[PDB]
Amino acid sequence: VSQVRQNYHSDCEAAVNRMLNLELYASYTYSSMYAFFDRDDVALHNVAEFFKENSHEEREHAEKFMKYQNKRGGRVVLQDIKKPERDEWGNTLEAMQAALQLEKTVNQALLDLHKLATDKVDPHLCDFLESEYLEEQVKDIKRIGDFITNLKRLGLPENGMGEYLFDKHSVKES
């Protein structure tokens, strides 16, 4: 037993390692989307940079779980980071739809971890998820939903001018 460990269930320790892996998986998927939108035959550079920034954020969220694990006296156990589901992402609408699904998958895992922490009467882990993860997820899901609504309004996937305008006006200039 770690000398610091107190009120930290083995099941929560393991679930934190699985959550860590899912954050790294989400990072890697966003890396793939960055590289796709940077292709010369795609060439939507503000969209590419949006996904690159998301990739960096998800890696930071993984590192925060590593630090958390050690603060509680759990032990970080790493597994392979699986490659993303697709090698190419179609267009901005298809990519944003996949991003929405990914963000909801991550949110469901965080909610499931909160349920486990609640079951094991771990208020520190509940607070950590509520204070550091759950609101960020709701905000990022809302942002991507708003983007999808605007891509549909702009006539994606068929309307190339609409896709061009989204890259200029909806995502930050990079």
What is residue 48's DSSP assignment? H
| CA 87, chain centre distance (Å) | 18
Instruction: Choose from Cl ion, Mg ion, Fe ion, none: what does 158 bind? Cβ within 5-8 Å by kind.
Output: Mg ion
Map the footprint of Cl ion across residues 73-132, applying CB under 5 A.
77, 86-88, 101-102, 105, 111
What binding mask, one character per residue, do residues 14-53 give for Cl ion by CB under 5 A, x or -? x--x------------------------------------
> Cα–Cα distance between 30 and 53 in angstroms, integer?
8
- Which one, of 67, 65, 54, lies nearest residue 28 by Cα? 54
Structure tokens at 42: 């795609």
For residue 137, say whether it is annotated as part of any ligand binding site.
Answer: yes
Does the annotation list 169 as a binding residue? no
- Whether residue 84 is preceded by a cis peptide bond, meaning omega within 30 degrees of 0, is no
Select the binding partner of residue 100 from Cl ion, a second copy, Fe ion, none (C-beta < 5 to 8 A, by kind). a second copy
The piece of 4-12, 88-96, 98-106, 118-126 that touches Fe ion (CB under 5 A) is 98-106
- CA dihedral 97→102→104→108, nearest 10 degrees, is 160
Residue 61 touches which of Cl ion, Mg ion, Fe ion, none (Cβ within 5-8 Å per kind): Fe ion
C-alpha to C-alpha distance for 127 and 39, rounded to whole angstroms:
41
Q: Which of residues 118-157 bind Fe ion (CB under 5 A)?
A: none
Residues of the shown chain interacting with Cl ion in the complex, contacts defined by CB under 5 A? 5, 7-10, 14, 17, 77, 86-88, 101-102, 105, 111, 135-136
